[PDB]
């Protein structure tokens, strides 16, 4: 099931607090679609955190 994999990429890998979910963060949805297609790189979780940072950055411009 995808529920376990997404819970992993949200809690274990991305260590994202439960207060931030899928209903709150559409860019997180679009990123989770592609993040789980790679199984490795889950060990250096800092790569995914920084990627979500820069995607939130590209999302929150005024242009």
């Amino acid at each position: 099931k995808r529920d376990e994999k997404h819970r992993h990429v949200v809690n274990v890998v991305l260590e994202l607090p439960t207060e931030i979910s899928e209903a709150t963060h559409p860019v997180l949805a679009t990123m989770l679609s592609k993040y789980t297609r790679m199984s490795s790189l889950f060990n250096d979780k800092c790569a995914f955190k920084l990627d979500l940072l820069r995607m939130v950055a590209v999302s929150r411009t005024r242009r």
């Binding site: 994202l16 607090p17 207060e19 931030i20 709150t24 963060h25 800092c46 790569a47 955190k49 920084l50 979500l52 940072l53 939130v56 929150r60």
Partner: peptide, 19 residues
Amino acid sequence: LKTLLVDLFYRPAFLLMPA
């Protein structure tokens, strides 16, 4: 700057930036 930017900006303030 990987860990620097992570532990610097990975706050709910920056992740939950309003439009």
